[PDB]
Amino acid sequence: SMNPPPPETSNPNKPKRQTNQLQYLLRVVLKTLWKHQFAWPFQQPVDAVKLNLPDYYKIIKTPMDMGTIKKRLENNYYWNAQECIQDFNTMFTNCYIYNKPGDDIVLMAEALEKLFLQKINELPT
């Protein structure tokens, strides 16, 4: 099959936590980025079959997307904010790795990453 199984959104072995900052990442950061005009490519795992990108997972080995992150946050999958933020960053870097500078999808990611940075610049205490 061209698509791998999607990243886990739960894990019984992994310890959960809820924090003010993780709460913020879901209610404010994720759910605001979600509403951006450029959010749609990043709202679900890359479907290599659907998007006709047969080489995507030959290149990207740590896929990540906001749909996954959203479910992780809802499941309280994360231990801390940093874990969630590194997922966001993985998603953006994946886009820059797979695509070329100037590509439309890259312009989109660049715009979201800027907004993402603006919102995590200050987190609740």
Ligand X SMILES: Cc1ccc2c(c1)NC(=O)[C@@H](C)O2
Among 41, 45, 71, 76, binds ligand X (CB under 6 A): 41
Find the part of the chain contacting ligand X (CB under 6 A) among 23-31, 70-78, 97-105, 113-121.
97-105
Task: Measure CA of the first residue to CA of the last residue in the chain; give whole Å.
Answer: 45
Of 98 and 116, which has the nearer Cβ to ligand X?
98
Residue 123 interacts with ligand X (CB under 6 A): yes or no: no
The counts of H helices and E strands in the chain are 6, 0
Q: For residue 18, which phi and psi values (nearest 5 degrees)?
A: -115, 135
Please say which residue, 4 or 41, places its beta carbon nearer to ligand X.
41
CA distance 65 to 7: 9
Residue nearest to ligand X (CB): 41
98 scored as a contact of ligand X (CB under 6 A): yes
Contacts of 108 (CB under 8 A, 6+ apart): 38, 41
| 50-68 core/surface letters (b: 16 or more CB in 10 A; e: else) | eeebeebeeebeebbbbbb
Query: Please, which residue, 38 or 79, has the CB nearer to ligand X?
Result: 38
Site stretch for ligand X (CB under 6 A), options 4-12, 16-24, 73-81, 95-103: 95-103
- 92 touches ligand X (CB under 6 A): no
* Interacting residues with ligand X (CB under 6 A): 41-42, 46, 51, 95, 98-99, 105
